[PDB]
Design an enzyme around this catalytic site. Structure first.
Site, PDB file in Angstrom:
ATOM      1  N   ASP A 224       0.825  -1.218   0.000  1.00 51.70           N
ATOM      2  CA  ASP A 224       0.000   0.000   0.000  1.00 51.70           C
ATOM      3  C   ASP A 224       0.860   1.269   0.000  1.00 51.70           C
ATOM      4  O   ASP A 224       1.274   1.749   1.063  1.00 51.70           O
ATOM      5  CB  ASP A 224      -0.941   0.012   1.214  1.00 51.70           C
ATOM      6  CG  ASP A 224      -2.031   1.083   1.104  1.00 51.70           C
ATOM      7  OD1 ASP A 224      -2.672   1.131   0.050  1.00 51.70           O
ATOM      8  OD2 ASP A 224      -2.282   1.844   2.067  1.00 51.70           O
TER       9      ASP A 224
ATOM     10  N   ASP B 217      -1.175   5.396  -5.511  1.00 50.44           N
ATOM     11  CA  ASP B 217      -1.582   4.452  -4.465  1.00 50.44           C
ATOM     12  C   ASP B 217      -1.810   3.060  -5.049  1.00 50.44           C
ATOM     13  O   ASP B 217      -2.859   2.790  -5.642  1.00 50.44           O
ATOM     14  CB  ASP B 217      -2.828   4.958  -3.750  1.00 50.44           C
ATOM     15  CG  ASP B 217      -3.272   4.023  -2.626  1.00 50.44           C
ATOM     16  OD1 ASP B 217      -2.485   3.127  -2.234  1.00 50.44           O
ATOM     17  OD2 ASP B 217      -4.406   4.184  -2.145  1.00 50.44           O
TER      18      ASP B 217
HETATM   19  C1  LIG Z   1      -4.184   7.329   7.417  1.00 51.07           C
HETATM   20  C2  LIG Z   1      -3.648   8.040   6.193  1.00 51.07           C
HETATM   21  C3  LIG Z   1      -3.513   7.136   4.990  1.00 51.07           C
HETATM   22  C4  LIG Z   1      -4.835   6.782   4.375  1.00 51.07           C
HETATM   23  N1  LIG Z   1      -4.695   6.290   3.010  1.00 51.07           N
HETATM   24  C5  LIG Z   1      -5.734   5.883   2.295  1.00 51.07           C
HETATM   25  O1  LIG Z   1      -6.877   5.894   2.738  1.00 51.07           O
HETATM   26  C6  LIG Z   1      -5.452   5.442   0.864  1.00 51.07           C
HETATM   27  C7  LIG Z   1      -5.692   6.648  -0.060  1.00 51.07           C
HETATM   28  C8  LIG Z   1      -6.320   4.238   0.448  1.00 51.07           C
HETATM   29  C9  LIG Z   1      -5.692   2.901   0.825  1.00 51.07           C
HETATM   30  O2  LIG Z   1      -4.736   2.563  -0.172  1.00 51.07           O
HETATM   31  C10 LIG Z   1      -6.729   1.779   0.969  1.00 51.07           C
HETATM   32  C11 LIG Z   1      -6.102   0.432   1.353  1.00 51.07           C
HETATM   33  C12 LIG Z   1      -7.207  -0.596   1.650  1.00 51.07           C
HETATM   34  C13 LIG Z   1      -7.800  -0.376   3.041  1.00 51.07           C
HETATM   35  C14 LIG Z   1      -6.727  -2.045   1.483  1.00 51.07           C
HETATM   36  C15 LIG Z   1      -6.580  -2.502   0.054  1.00 51.07           C
HETATM   37  C16 LIG Z   1      -7.734  -3.294  -0.441  1.00 51.07           C
HETATM   38  C17 LIG Z   1      -7.567  -3.767  -1.881  1.00 51.07           C
HETATM   39  C18 LIG Z   1      -8.339  -2.941  -2.857  1.00 51.07           C
HETATM   40  C19 LIG Z   1      -9.627  -2.447  -2.252  1.00 51.07           C
HETATM   41  C20 LIG Z   1     -10.388  -1.578  -3.151  1.00 51.07           C
HETATM   42  C21 LIG Z   1      -9.966  -0.132  -3.085  1.00 51.07           C
HETATM   43  O3  LIG Z   1      -9.768   0.517  -4.108  1.00 51.07           O
HETATM   44  N2  LIG Z   1      -9.857   0.394  -1.859  1.00 51.07           N
HETATM   45  C22 LIG Z   1      -9.481   1.791  -1.675  1.00 51.07           C
HETATM   46  C23 LIG Z   1     -10.711   2.685  -1.783  1.00 51.07           C
HETATM   47  C24 LIG Z   1      -8.777   2.042  -0.344  1.00 51.07           C
HETATM   48  O4  LIG Z   1      -9.354   2.623   0.571  1.00 51.07           O
HETATM   49  N3  LIG Z   1      -7.514   1.623  -0.251  1.00 51.07           N
END
Ligand SMILES: CCCCNC(=O)[C@H](C)C[C@H](O)[C@@H]1C[C@H](C)CCCCCCCC(=O)N[C@@H](C)C(=O)N1
EC number: 3.4.23.46
Length: 377
Positions: free
Chosen positions: A35, A220
């Protein structure tokens, strides 16, 4: 020695890419989602209906409790847990072991995915967005500080059930063609970049370029879709609709809620446009572009009923927290996270999915004036 890391990523389409890791002494094997959109290393540490295995702190002689709670919210999904440290290594990575911060997940909501085959998450971004605060050193920072692994990594995400490579500590030149084009990391928190122009089938969207980065633009590997700010999302959908008007769509399709199908091998790729994202370059008034094919933003989904048709979901969605260049973007390219030089490189991937008349591309140089004004403040 990077051949040992080629093909070290696996996954299911739309459920993230994961790398194998071990935590604790004796080593406990877990599959960890990669991630670049976050900065916490966390693992399932309690039973869960979707987890086949989890981290057992009681069984590790090197586990150290930090006596601190932690919560991390994502765009979709969240978890809370208990902080600690333990020894971590990557079997198909550098031959080294580091003591790293680990969040032991004790409760979660819409985070783990049924049948995804991963049990934890490796946040590869910077300390500034780590929870609870930026004093919790992220894994890659620990890796670089404790070993001789150079301060960079690269990701080759291959789409269609999915595979890829995370080259830790370098660039593997056998994995891409053409030249690498670099865009500055605007600020070290997310992997934030600046988009300076957008074209669809060669036509400029002609929006104020701040709109493209409204809030921010990040890279991302943990987001499936290309996520676009409201105004940009509407303009792009309007353009993609117009180009494919000869066909009928449930319109829930354009929101990602409904999938569209066509007889096997008859998908009309030609009527869906290519999207060009221009990124700020390394020299004054210079940019470059990466071009996306419809095969990237029309994600194939297996129709569980009559497997007689090719069905797809629209993988471009609206955002209220800026642009997210997710797997839809990254799968066409070899992406270098050159932390040491504060830049992100793009090259055509050796595992690029391409049709018969068009080709995904990374092209430059282009001249673009006032690129600094495209960043939002
Ligand atoms: C606390 C500060 C950091 C926060 N970062 C985030 O929220 C980033 C931008 C997103 C993460 O990569 C999160 C990571 C998630 C939990 C786990 C990955 C799951 C696989 C794909 C799932 C479908 C998808 O597309 N999920 C997105 C919407 C998502 O929320 N992605």
């Amino acid at each position: 020695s990077f051949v040992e890391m080629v093909d070290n990523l696996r996954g299911k389409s739309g459920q993230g890419y994961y790398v194998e890791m071990t935590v604790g002494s004796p080593p406990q094997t877990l599959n960890i989602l990669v991630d670049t959109g976050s900065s916490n290393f966390a693992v399932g540490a309690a039973p869960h209906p979707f987890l086949h295995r989890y981290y057992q702190r009681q069984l590790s002689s090197t586990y150290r409790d930090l006596r601190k709670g932690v919560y991390v919210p994502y765009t979709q999904g969240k978890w809370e847990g208990e902080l600690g440290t333990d020894l971590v290594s990557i079997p198909h990575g550098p031959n080294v072991t580091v003591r790293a911060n680990i969040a032991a997940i004790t409760e979660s909501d819409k985070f783990f995915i049924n049948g995804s085959n991963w049990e934890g998450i490796l946040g590869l971004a910077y300390a500034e967005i780590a929870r609870p605060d930026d004093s919790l050193e992220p894994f890659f920072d620990s890796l670089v500080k404790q070993t001789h692994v150079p301060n960079l990594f690269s990701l080759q995400l291959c789409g269609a059930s999915v595979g890829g490579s995370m080259i830790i500590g370098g660039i593997d030149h056998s994995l891409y063609t053409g030249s690498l084009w670099y865009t500055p990391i605007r600020r070290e928190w997310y992997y934030e970049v600046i988009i300076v122009r957008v074209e669809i089938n060669g036509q400029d969207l002609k929006m104020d370029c701040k709109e493209y980065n409204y809030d921010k633009s990040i890279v991302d590997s943990g987001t499936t879709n290309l996520r676009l700010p409201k105004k940009v999302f509407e303009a792009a959908v309007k353009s993609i609709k117009a180009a494919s008007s000869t066909e009928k769509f449930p319109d829930g399709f354009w929101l990602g809620e409904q999938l569209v199908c066509w007889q096997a091998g008859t998908t009309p790729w030609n009527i869906f446009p290519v999207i060009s994202l221009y990124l700020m370059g390394e020299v004054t008034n210079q940019s470059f572009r990466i071009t996306i094919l419809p095969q990237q933003y029309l994600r194939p989904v297996e129709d569980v009923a009559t497997s007689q048709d090719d069905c797809y979901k629209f993988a471009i969605s609206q955002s209220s927290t800026g642009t997210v260049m997710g797997a839809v973007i990254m799968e066409g390219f070899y992406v270098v996270f050159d932390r040491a030089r504060k830049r992100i490189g793009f090259a055509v991937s050796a595992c690029h999915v391409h049709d018969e008349f068009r080709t995904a591309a990374v092209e430059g140089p282009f001249v673009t004036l006032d690129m600094e004004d495209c960043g939002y403040n």
